């Protein structure tokens, strides 16, 4: 309703006015099928510019990082009615965010069905299950003999709504979810995607084996990019279409302008002799009229010796100088980039010509002396 005599009943059923002069309300407030104790003292008139509001310590843990919010809302909100709307809305927010603490599953469907269904698959399949039982991650095999993993993140109702599927491989995966579908169903869909992309995988595996793939290190199955090295201090980066893998990619070369120019010319001249009945390597070798190095150096292949903020060597004369005092990062930077960076952080403090604060990559103490 308009007025907060019926509208306040309808929108706060469990707030029982104790006093005749409706100054103390007491009892429960509702949110996400959960009721909370709440005791809300007004002054002698209906003015929230001055009011008390006490809570259960339950509710106060759940209003943590909102205290100023609520105090401002008491001062800024015209009526009690709207105040309660704002307060519920804010509870709404608070719980859904802290979703890790709050999940009472209906066992009779859940924990039994999930067991039945993992039995339906086979027990070699499942590889990880979380003790909140929210996450699972499953395994599948190629005709090749490659493992590909699938994460599922599951809700209070598994069989009702979709399970959130998180997947590696580079085309967007489609799972037709019904209430009738189950783990075996989405698993068969996932196998279908595997056996479909078989060619693209063979291309990637063939490359990684018979060449010095250099930049993506331990490649995922999602990566379309392969910065291959060849000769010395020249490289080719090659971005591939999965749907037509053997077909021609967008490509270009890094290194010496005097070394690369001839290869570009030669490529532009032989590029009509690309053929999607050969392999990518068997096309590249005879198009560019070359053989590749199979790991000319496997230990000191390359460590990216660039700024790790701006990713340039030679920013206005300056060199990658300032490093991390850490064995696991070692990452060089620039004087300019690291100063601009650390000034900005809240963790940074500046002494006379010194700036203390966190390495961008590893969050360990790093010192900059201007």
């Amino acid at each position: 309703m308009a007025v907060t005599e019926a509208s306040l009943l309808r929108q706060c059923p469990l707030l029982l006015p104790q006093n005749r002069s409706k100054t103390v309300y007491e009892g429960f407030i509702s949110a996400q099928g959960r009721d909370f104790h709440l005791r809300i003292v007004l002054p002698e008139d209906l003015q929230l510019k001055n009011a008390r509001l006490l809570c259960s310590w339950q509710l106060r843990t759940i209003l943590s990082g909102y205290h100023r919010i609520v105090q401002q809302r008491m001062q800024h909100s015209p009526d009690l009615m709207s105040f309660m709307m704002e307060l519920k809305m804010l509870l709404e927010v608070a719980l859904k965010n802290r979703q890790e603490l709050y999940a009472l599953p209906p066992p009779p469907q859940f924990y039994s069905s999930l067991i039945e269904e993992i039995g339906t698959l086979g027990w070699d399949k499942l590889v990880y299950a979380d003790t909140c039982f929210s996450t699972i991650k499953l395994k599948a095999e190629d005709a090749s003999g490659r493992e590909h993993l699938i994460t599922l993140k599951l809700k209070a109702k598994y069989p009702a709504e979709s399970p959130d599927y998180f997947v590696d491989f580079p085309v967007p995966f489609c799972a037709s979810w019904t209430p009738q579908s189950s783990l075996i169903s989405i698993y068969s869909q996932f196998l279908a995607a595997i056996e479909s992309l078989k060619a693209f995988w063979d291309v990637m595996d063939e490359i990684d084996e018979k060449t010095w793939v250099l930049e993506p290190e331990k490649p995922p199955r999602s990566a379309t990019a392969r910065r291959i090295a060849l000769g010395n201090n020249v490289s080719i980066n090659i971005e591939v279409d999965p749907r037509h893998p053997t077909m021609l990619p967008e490509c270009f070369f890094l290194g010496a302008d005097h070394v690369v120019k001839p290869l570009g010319i030669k490529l532009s001249r032989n590029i009509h002799l690309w053929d999607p009945e050969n392999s990518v390597l068997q096309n590249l070798k005879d198009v560019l009229e070359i053989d590749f190095p199979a790991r000319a150096i496997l230990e000191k292949s390359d460590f990216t010796m660039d700024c790790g903020i701006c990713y340039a060597y030679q920013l206005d004369g300056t060199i990658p100088d300032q490093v991390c005092d850490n064995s696991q990062c070692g990452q060089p930077f620039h004087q300019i980039c690291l100063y601009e960076w650390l000034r900005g952080l809240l963790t940074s403090r500046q002494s006379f010509n010194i700036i203390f604060g966190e390495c961008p990559y590893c969050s360990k103490p790093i010192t900059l002396k201007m």
């Binding site: 990619p249 967008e250 590029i271 990713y311 340039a312 900005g344």
Partner: protein
């Protein structure tokens, strides 16, 4: 030669009732609305100045009632006094209202008050007391330190902003958002006064950490206007940030290209190329977002006209500046072409990127024959896992000038047994969305025309009516352009080109269309360094004489 008084006498009462609103622009609203209406205020002042200049003062009482109050209100408003020449014009208005020999008491009082207000604009100490006292002490006139004073005032605020910028989420003095908006409002009226331009560029780089914009778009549009009319020349980093925070500025500037290819310099592609390279579009189109927005406005124009040769030309040029800008500023960390060109095979692009500067004249037929194959794969075998359709693979084919144009000029060189692939290619270019039925018809029409033309070339220099026969529908522009290629290419031309031109020039549209053809061809040859000097001089001559006829 009708009204003279009336429109100005109305707009007078409008502006006087507006000046009284503003009243020294010490507040937000008075400033924003002044910022807007000032320019029209200036034009009003031009018409007013003409009127007061042609006539003489103290004699006439036309608008003399409250002209005084208008010029008071004007001058004590500093946002007025800051704009291009509004000051200069106010000076002139006052110099019109002066008198040489004042006669009644009123005229002397007037003229004194006139010197007063000029002295208030130019030479008044409406500034901090101690600095006045100190300088007067050192025996300095405002004139000799104002400049350095201004310079220091600016470098201060620019510095301040750069530390605001670098302290992003730090427990340290946060430049007041209100004050930044304040400065921005003051950048507008004196953008073309060189002693702010560091401030500006500091504003555009130094965005800071807000979800909300802080600057008011009257700032962005003042700046945009001034970039395009070349009153500003900032560095390019300034203007990428400008585009990348105010979309209607980046609209406003790609539309200010369109005025250039429509009105001013129809088919002077040198002039168009130089405007694109001086504008910073290429470098700003290295950011994939601004590429996508710009090519949307290009797509909207490809449709309004159904494949206008003039917009095809501007694309070809723009793309060539862009591609050279990509290569240049893309050593490490560049976005993959399915990012700029998402609605095609990256395969096809990677072919079409290879320029003909780097291939021999003889191997271009091979290149086109490869393109025909992959386009036919994309269009005819229009299945899942492809382009969305034929139109998209065409809008790609446009963005490469060179390849679409060279087909006709290569057909004439291989007119004896023409390759079916080239006939596919050219038919596709002049007509997508036909059915195989309509493409085969077009191809065989062109094949018969190749027969007639090769007979005519291997014959002597013949009439123009023999060509008018085959000229005499859906495939007209194809045949026209191929025919012009024939004229320029064969040495049987240079004699009977005029003879066909005169007849083919039915309308002015055909004339302009062929002119665009010829400008494109000259630009194309002079780039690629491929030439018979006969054809070059002939095209130049024809183009020169036909641009007069229109």
């Amino acid at each position: 030669m009708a009204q003279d008084s009336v429109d100005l006498s109305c707009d007078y009462q409008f502006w006087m009732q507006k000046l009284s609103v503003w009243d020294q622009a010490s507040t937000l609203e008075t400033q924003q609305d002044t910022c807007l209406h000032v320019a029209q205020f200036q034009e009003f002042l031009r018409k007013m100045y003409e009127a007061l200049k042609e006539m003489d003062s103290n004699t006439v009482i036309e608008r003399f009632p409250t002209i005084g109050q208008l010029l008071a209100k004007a001058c004590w408003n500093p946002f007025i006094l800051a704009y291009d020449e509004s000051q200069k014009i106010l000076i002139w208005c006052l110099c019109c209202l002066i008198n040489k020999e004042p006669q009644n008491s009123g005229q002397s009082k007037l003229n004194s008050w006139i010197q007063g207000v000029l002295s208030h604009i130019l030479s008044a100490l409406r500034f901090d007391k101690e600095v006045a006292l100190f300088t007067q002490g050192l025996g300095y006139a405002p004139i000799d330190y104002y400049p350095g004073l201004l310079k220091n005032m600016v470098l201060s605020l620019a510095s301040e902003l750069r530390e605001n910028h670098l302290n992003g989420f730090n427990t340290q003095r946060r430049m007041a958002p209100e004050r930044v908006a304040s400065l921005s409002r003051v950048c507008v009226p004196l953008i073309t006064l060189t002693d702010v331009d560091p401030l500006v560029e500091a504003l555009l780089i130094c965005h800071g950490r807000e979800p909300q914009e802080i600057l008011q778009p009257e700032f962005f549009e003042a700046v945009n206007e001034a970039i395009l009319l070349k009153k500003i020349s900032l560095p390019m980093s300034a203007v990428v940030c400008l585009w990348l925070r105010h979309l209607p500025s980046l609209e406003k500037a790609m539309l200010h290209l369109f005025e250039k290819l429509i009105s001013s310099e129809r088919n002077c592609l040198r002039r168009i190329e130089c405007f694109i390279k001086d504008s910073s579009l290429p470098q700003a189109a290295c950011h994939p977002a601004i590429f996508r927005v710009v090519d949307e406005m290009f797509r909207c124009a490809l449709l309004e006209t159904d494949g206008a040769l003039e917009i095809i030309a501007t694309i070809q040029v723009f793309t060539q500046c862009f591609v050279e800008a990509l290569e240049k500023a893309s050593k490490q960390l560049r976005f993959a072409l399915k990012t700029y060109f998402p609605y095609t095979s990256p395969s096809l692009a990677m072919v079409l990127l290879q320029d003909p500067q780097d291939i021999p004249r003889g191997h271009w037929l091979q290149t086109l024959k490869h393109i025909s194959e992959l386009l036919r794969e994309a269009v005819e075998d229009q299945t899942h896992g492809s382009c969305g359709g034929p139109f998209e693979s065409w809008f790609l084919f446009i963005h490469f000038g060179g390849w679409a144009e060279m087909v006709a000029e290569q057909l004439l060189m291989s007119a004896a047994e023409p390759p079916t692939a080239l006939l596919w290619l050219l038919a596709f270019y002049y007509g997508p969305r036909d059915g195989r039925q309509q493409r085969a018809q077009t191809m065989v029409q062109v094949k018969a025309v190749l027969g007639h033309l090769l007979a005519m070339s291997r014959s002597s220099s013949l009439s123009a009516q023999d060509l008018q026969t085959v000229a005499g529908a859906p495939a007209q522009q194809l045949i026209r352009h191929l025919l012009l290629n024939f004229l320029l290419w064969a040495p049987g031309g240079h004699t009977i080109a005029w003879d066909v031109i005169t007849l083919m020039a039915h309308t002015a549209e055909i004339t302009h269309e062929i002119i665009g053809f010829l400008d494109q061809t000259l630009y194309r040859w002079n780039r690629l360094g491929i030439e018979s000097p006969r054809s070059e001089k002939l095209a130049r001559e024809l183009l020169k004489e036909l641009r007069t006829q229109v």
